[PDB]
Amino acid sequence: GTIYPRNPAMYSEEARLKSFQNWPDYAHLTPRELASAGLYYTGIGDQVQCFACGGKLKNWEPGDRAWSEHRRHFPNCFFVLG
Ligand SMILES: CN[C@@H](C)C(=O)N[C@H]1CN(C(=O)c2ccc(N)cc2)c2ccccc2N(Cc2c(OC)ccc3ccccc23)C1=O
Ligand SMILES: [Zn+2]
């Protein structure tokens, strides 16, 4: 194919959801929201990563939305654009 996800295993939303087992208690965004936006937990801090583009996102602020931050930093991501 003409595109390729950075992390094929994390193609699955359920796999992304499971990655949040040890998501920090200070991290306010829900694993549901984050997984839905293509993001899984890297195991470091509040840093997640997109399965598709491989972009990372961390240091989440109140008012942040997963999709909106994904699109702001990584607007040409095929998951964003799909
Ligand atoms: C308010 N909403 C939150 C989600 C937010 O916008 N957080 C910032 C914080 N952030 C960092 O924490 C950061 C990134 C790289 C780095 N060397 C140091 C700090 C960023 C800083 C500058 C540009 C982009 C980011 N990025 C995205 C980002 C990048 O944006 C293109 C690039 C590299 C990144 C590496 C690790 C984590 C994030 C990276 C953020 O997610
Ligand atoms: Zn992406």
Curated annotation (Swiss-Prot):
S-Nitrosylation down-regulates its E3 ubiquitin-protein ligase activity. Autoubiquitinated. Ubiquitinated by TRIM32; leading to proteasomal degradation. It is linked to Lymphoproliferative syndrome, X-linked, 2: A rare immunodeficiency characterized by extreme susceptibility to infection with Epstein-Barr virus (EBV). Symptoms include severe or fatal mononucleosis, acquired hypogammaglobulinemia, pancytopenia and malignant lymphoma. Multi-functional protein which regulates not only caspases and apoptosis, but also modulates inflammatory signaling and immunity, copper homeostasis, mitogenic kinase signaling, cell proliferation, as well as cell invasion and metastasis. Acts as a direct caspase inhibitor. Directly bind to the active site pocket of CASP3 and CASP7 and obstructs substrate entry. Inactivates CASP9 by keeping it in a monomeric, inactive state. Changing residue 64 to S: Reduced interaction with HTRA2. Reduced interaction with HTRA2. This is E3 ubiquitin-protein ligase XIAP. The first BIR domain is involved in interaction with TAB1/MAP3K7IP1 and is important for dimerization. The second BIR domain is sufficient to inhibit CASP3 and CASP7, while the third BIR is involved in CASP9 inhibition. The interactions with DIABLO/SMAC and HTRA2/PRSS25 are mediated by the second and third BIR domains. It comes from the Eukaryota. BIR repeats lie at residues 13-80. The lineage of its organism: Eukaryota, Metazoa, Chordata, Craniata, Vertebrata. Monomer, and homodimer. Part of a complex composed of SEPTIN4 isoform ARTS, XIAP and BCL2, within the complex interacts with SEPTIN4 isoform ARTS and BCL2, SEPTIN4 isoform ARTS acts as a scaffold protein and stabilizes the complex. Interacts (via BIR3 domain) with DIABLO/SMAC; the interaction inhibits apoptotic suppressor activity. Interacts with HTRA2/PRSS25; the interaction inhibits apoptotic suppressor activity. Interacts with TAB1/MAP3K7IP1 and AIFM1. Interaction with DIABLO/SMAC hinders binding of TAB1/MAP3K7IP1 and AIFM1. Interacts with TCF25 and COMMD1. The chain holds residues 152 to 232 of 497 of the full protein. It is found in: Cytoplasm; Nucleus.
